[PDB]
């Protein structure tokens, strides 16, 4: 019944099909793991994706964004990468446990990026910053692509994001292509907030998070991001339109309903062009499997209609309700209602509190009840996000800036010349 | 996933009446169309009434309008009304869910509905 198929350990011998050492598209292979189809997990700290962010030791301290924490020596030891492998993996577990994150690793699964990465109108080929480099027994190396990757953070550990590589012309994030996602995230540490009671020594149940960057992920997996230029800025630092959207709640209505309504028109234009780039294509290259085959798994993905002449369209409220779906439906708001959990009640929360925390052991979390036990002292009041009565599960590293308690007042940017 | 249990059944008279109820509390009630189906012995699992999230509802032939179906979007529950019960429709029925995206499908555990 679960999620990950496989009982994996980081110690386990590499076969080169789940299991394998890989190389990303700009280093000598490190090991990961292939906990799903299309989904890539590497125990490593993140030196790979931008080598400019390939040295762990901290920047100065002026140089420091006051929420942050460095640990050049964390997830460096075989047992660290063994307890991050075994805790995202949980982690994923407990997402799946809902039928909200079932839904959203779903669409994460088959929302496989987009083959329009050829030269030529009428053929159909992968864009290779949507593969990895997996080696063989034999020693060779295999171009395969995939959908995600969970990635360890880099120099700053609470820097959890979601990138990706880009096309040197296309947007593939925005023009409905979709291009692999690589998340920096680590569920050995957590956030408290402070959210005033109606005394807030509450901690972020790391499912929360993680499922946060994974709504990111399938913006960006289906290319319909929004633009990471539209930003409103605050003052009594900034926040981007998608990360309000990601939220959800009452952060998402920051967009004006016009704004929103845009983002629809423009994204069902461009699914409709994409299922007539699928009517037009005629031959494949790279791939043992057919043209048909492609235009069958891409129109899965976006859920194009097909009549009885082959050709695809896209049926406009299927389009309503799976746009709802990945930008309404997949929210942090909704994640945390079908958690049950305490949580941040706005983006804006900006104040954070690090702690670490070991979410393996099943007397410490589990997938059901996360922190809030079944049965236990930890079930009630969500006592088991209480830093202190569940003490023995959260140990401070940093206390809280407090340099965020004021109201956020949002003025929308207006655009700005780019390179 | 999530259990779906079917409440309502039971034997009654032939030419009376029943309420049938699914809940799915803990689904996203919205991007599915809740159905009945109904499951005779050595028959098979046939459409009884399935009814979209915007409300429109479709019903089978071998119902003439005696069954109708509700759907409670705020308590993400359905019922199912069924008039004038015959002896054909002894069987047992289950609730599905039907991902409006064919993701995936949901699938109750039945009650049993009998009568004479």
């Known amino acids: 019944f679960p999620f990950v198929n496989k009982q994996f350990n980081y110690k386990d011998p590499v076969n080169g099909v789940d299991i394998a050492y890989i190389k990303i598209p700009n280093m000598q292979p490190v090991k990961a793991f292939k906990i799903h189809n299309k989904i890539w997990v590497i125990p490593e700290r993140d030196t790979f994706t931008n080598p400019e962010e390939g040295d762990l030791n901290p920047p100065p301290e002026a140089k420091q964004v006051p929420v942050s924490y460095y640990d050049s020596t964390y997830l460096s030891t075989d047992n660290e990468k063994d307890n991050y492998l075994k805790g995202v993996t949980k982690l994923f577990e407990r997402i799946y446990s809902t039928d909200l994150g079932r839904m959203l690793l779903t669409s994460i699964v088959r929302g496989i990026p987009f083959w329009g990465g050829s030269t030529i109108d009428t053929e159909l080929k992968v864009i290779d910053t949507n593969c990895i480099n997996v080696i063989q027994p034999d020693g060779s190396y295999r171009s395969e692509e995939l959908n995600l990757v969970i990635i360890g953070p880099s120099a700053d550990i609470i820097q959890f994001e979601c990138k990706s590589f880009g096309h040197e012309v296309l947007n593939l994030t925005r023009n409905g292509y979709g291009s692999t996602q690589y998340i920096r995230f680590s569920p050995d540490f957590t956030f408290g907030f402070e959210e005033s009671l109606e005394a807030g020594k509450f901690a972020t149940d790391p499912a929360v998070t993680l499922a946060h960057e994974l709504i990111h992920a399938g913006h960006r997996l289906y290319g319909i991001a929004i633009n990471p230029n539209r930003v409103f800025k605050v003052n009594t630092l900034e926040v981007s339109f998608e990360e309000l959207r990601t939220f959800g709640g009452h952060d998402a209505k920051f967009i004006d309903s016009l704004q929103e309504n845009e983002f629809r028109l423009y994204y069902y234009n461009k699914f409709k062009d994409i299922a007539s780039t699928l009517n037009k294509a005629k031959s494949i290259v790279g791939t043992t499997a057919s043209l048909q085959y492609m235009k069958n798994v891409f129109k899965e993905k976006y859920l194009l209609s097909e009549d009885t002449s082959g050709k695809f369209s896209v049926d406009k409220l299927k389009f309503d309700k799976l746009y709802k779906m990945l930008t309404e439906i997949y929210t942090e708001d909704n994640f945390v209602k079908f958690f049950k959990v305490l949580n941040r009640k706005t983006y804006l929360n900006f104040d954070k509190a690090v702690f670490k925390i070991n979410i393996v052991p099943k007397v410490n979390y589990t997938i059901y009840d996360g922190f809030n036990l079944r049965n236990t002292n930890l079930a009630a009041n969500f006592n088991g996000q209480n830093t202190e009565i569940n003490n023995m599960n959260f140990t401070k590293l940093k206390n809280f800036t407090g340099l965020f308690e004021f109201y956020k007042l949002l003025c929308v940017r207006g655009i700005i010349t780019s390179k | 996933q999530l259990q779906l249990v079917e409440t309502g059944g039971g034997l009654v008279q032939p030419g009376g009446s029943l309420r049938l109820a699914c809940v799915a509390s803990?689904?996203?009630?919205?991007?599915?169309?809740v159905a009945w189906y109904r499951q005779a012995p050595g028959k098979q699992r046939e459409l009884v009434a399935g009814?979209?999230?915007?409300?429109?509802?479709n019903y089978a032939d071998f119902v003439k309008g005696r069954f109708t179906i509700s759907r409670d979007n705020s308590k993400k529950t359905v019922h199912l009304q069924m008039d004038n019960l015959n002896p054909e429709d002894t069987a047992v029925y289950y609730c599905?869910?039907?991902?409006?995206?064919?993701?995936?499908?949901?699938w109750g555990q039945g009650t049993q509905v009998t009568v004479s």
């Open positions: 803990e689904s996203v009630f919205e991007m599915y169309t």
């Open positions: 009814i979209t999230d915007e409300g429109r509802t």
């Open positions: 599905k869910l039907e991902h409006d995206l064919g993701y995936y499908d949901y």
